[PDB]
Amino acid sequence: KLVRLPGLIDVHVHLREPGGTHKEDFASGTAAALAGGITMVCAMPNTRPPIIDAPALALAQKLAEAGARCDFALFLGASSENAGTLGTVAGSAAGLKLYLNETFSELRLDSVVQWMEHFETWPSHLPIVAHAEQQTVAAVLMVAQLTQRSVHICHVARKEEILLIKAAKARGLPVTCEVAPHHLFLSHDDLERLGPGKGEVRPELGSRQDVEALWENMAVIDCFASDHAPHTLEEKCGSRPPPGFPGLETMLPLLLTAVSEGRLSLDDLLQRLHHNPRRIFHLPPQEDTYVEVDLEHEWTIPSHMPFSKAHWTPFEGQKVKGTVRRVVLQGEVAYIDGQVLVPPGYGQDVRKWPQGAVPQLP
Amino acid sequence: KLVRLPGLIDVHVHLREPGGTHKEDFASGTAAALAGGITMVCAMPNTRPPIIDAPALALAQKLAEAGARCDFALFLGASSENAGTLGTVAGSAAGLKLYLNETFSELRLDSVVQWMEHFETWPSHLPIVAHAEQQTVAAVLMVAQLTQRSVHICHVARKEEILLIKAAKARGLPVTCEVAPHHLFLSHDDLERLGPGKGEVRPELGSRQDVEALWENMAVIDCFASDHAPHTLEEKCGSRPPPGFPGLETMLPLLLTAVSEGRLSLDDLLQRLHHNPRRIFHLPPQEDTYVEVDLEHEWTIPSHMPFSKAHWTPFEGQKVKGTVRRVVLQGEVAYIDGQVLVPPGYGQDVRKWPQGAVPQLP
Ligand SMILES: O=C(O)c1[nH]c(=O)[nH]c(=O)c1F
Numbered sequence A, B: 001k002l003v004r005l006p007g008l009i010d011v012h013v014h015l016r017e018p019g020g021t022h023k024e025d026f027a028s029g030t031a032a033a034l035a036g037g038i039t040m041v042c043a044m045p046n047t048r049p050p051i052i053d054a055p056a057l058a059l060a061q062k063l064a065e066a067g068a069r070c071d072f073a074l075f076l077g078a079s080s081e082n083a084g085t086l087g088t089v090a091g092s093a094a095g096l097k098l099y100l101n102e103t104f105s106e107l108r109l110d111s112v113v114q115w116m117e118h119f120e121t122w123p124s125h126l127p128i129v130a131h132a133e134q135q136t137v138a139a140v141l142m143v144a145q146l147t148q149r150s151v152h153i154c155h156v157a158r159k160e161e162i163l164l165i166k167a168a169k170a171r172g173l174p175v176t177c178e179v180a181p182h183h184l185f186l187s188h189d190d191l192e193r194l195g196p197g198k199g200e201v202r203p204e205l206g207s208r209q210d211v212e213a214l215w216e217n218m219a220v221i222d223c224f225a226s227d228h229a230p231h232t233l234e235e236k237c238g239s240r241p242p243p244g245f246p247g248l249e250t251m252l253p254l255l256l257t258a259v260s261e262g263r264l265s266l267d268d269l270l271q272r273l274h275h276n277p278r279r280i281f282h283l284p285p286q287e288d289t290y291v292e293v294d295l296e297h298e299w300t301i302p303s304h305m306p307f308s309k310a311h312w313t314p315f316e317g318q319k320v321k322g323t324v325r326r327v328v329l330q331g332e333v334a335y336i337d338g339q340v341l342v343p344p345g346y347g348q349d350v351r352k353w354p355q356g357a358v359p360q361l362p
């Protein structure tokens, strides 16, 4: 018997279009999403050009509307120049992403004062998410408190970070967070197999104690999100390997395996891949949309998944129990047993739906 | 300018049909819901006969399908006899309600062992909610831990209770809770005006310190829910006054006033009347459903609201800023400026929708 799930949401993907389409584009990345049981994605802004101004957002919107096979929202990215300039387009974005650790020059913030300025100028009712590692989690939480608003922490990867967030939540602070599958299912123990190129990711793979701490503190994790960060094997194995793993096609199989093993419940999974993404980012429901999964069939992750142009995966060799069998999106069969059946352009910008606008006071 | 809200959900109403229809029926209670900006309600099982077996649920389902003007789900109620007998109908109910303090004989549980039996036999993927006051909150939390599952605490009304729940959440325990408007906007200070009959409610009105504690610990409150508990003025002012307040028509105006005053944000309100009710009870979205409210218009709550057959309200005399102007339900105008425009029977049982079934493992 198949299990029917609602349309799952991944609030953290890199679809590389514009500017990196040999790694991934909207069409191939959203095919990977559908194959992973994901019917709506939020795409990060560190493209080339980066989505840091209204013209770049306008271009990305059209590229996504023409290429996406599932529904989507597009993040804006904070820069050292664009605080106080995004007000007219802010409501059309998934949210504002701050890169507070390593990034490309155009997204680099050189001073916490620049973080303050973004928290002060970005509309207070709209989401802010941050790449914020180790101490940076505490620092950006401080900025959120000074500006009296919420923040969402991307890919929490360390015992240090989840315990800090746990302490903040105990004090009633408005902070939510997401965890990516590689930080639950990979660790330092895998670096010998992966090698130093493939193993490059930010946040880096943690210790076994880091991984154990995230599982022990599942109650503190609001969302799962893949941080789908595709690069080709040539790039990952070359002289300056970029950080990141592809993950859309492997997320749900990995987590369904954990569910089968009693590590978390089916509800725990659906809170973290459906309900909490909806409520943190004010994402609308998807009419006549659902995912049918098979929890009985055991298989081994191969050297590459069928759809991501990354054409490699760090989870190769792991045994999983859980398969996406069928995806229905907006009343149409979008995916069945390895075949994507909706064309590029079938997906839509959920922020343009009346029910996708973020409610605000007049 | 009007503000567009999603369809709000009240997970705790008493609609009195069958058996108490002079107090309220499905048609009048759901009219009150729509006038309060509420498009889906979860109806408690302490009717006459109480909804404690499959035949009674079958009757209530038809009465609701014929009378409800908004969408709904129906709770089953725990009794001293029905543990282990509800398995075939459990998935069709909103959840299982346990009355752990005062109640009618048919819903009275005389031993914590009976609570254990319900937690052991009720399907583990389906909701359990409890009327659990003071120590009873800790006791039912203990039963939840022994049976390794979650519990939702109805109408938290005391500093003692919210602090206990706060401590449980800090330990990672799966507990959620709701707070009713009278415990945020009324207190002991109002008992002289109300009198001892009108003022009867369970949980009773709290001290100013209780009320202040709930506001201070808003982060711990998952849901708002009215505990709409209608009785006629004759009953409230008579020789054996039943406990309870009507509240569907006054909830949102009261909370919108608080939002206008900066006591909580619009998002805080929508998490507690839309997103968290959805995710705790696995309630489906409502297609083409939304509520338009006006935050500018000031008015004073009268001696009775237009629709509840209770025909009185404990909030008489309070000044509010916030009005439900229009409700659209499933693509039809359901309410405009005091006029309900959908007939009895327009509402449906959301648990019969494919997307309203609670996902479970095979
Ligand atoms: O875009 C990427 O590849 C990327 N990869 C990572 O591993 N971390 C990032 O923060 C990032 F932006």
Ligand SMILES: O=C(O)c1[nH]c(=O)[nH]c(=O)c1F
Pocket: B014, B046, B131, B200, B201, B202, B203, B229, B230, B242, B243, B244, B245
């Ligand atoms: O049904 C009612 O009137 C009712 N009224 C209350 O004040 N508390 C209850 O727990 C209840 F079931």
Ligand SMILES: [Zn+2]
Pocket: A131, A154, A155, A202, A203
């Ligand atoms: Zn990142």
Ligand SMILES: [Zn+2]
Pocket: A012, A014, A044, A227, A229
């Ligand atoms: Zn990323």
Ligand SMILES: [Zn+2]
Pocket: B131, B154, B155, B202, B203
């Ligand atoms: Zn009660």
Ligand SMILES: [Zn+2]
Pocket: B012, B014, B044, B227, B229
């Ligand atoms: Zn009640």
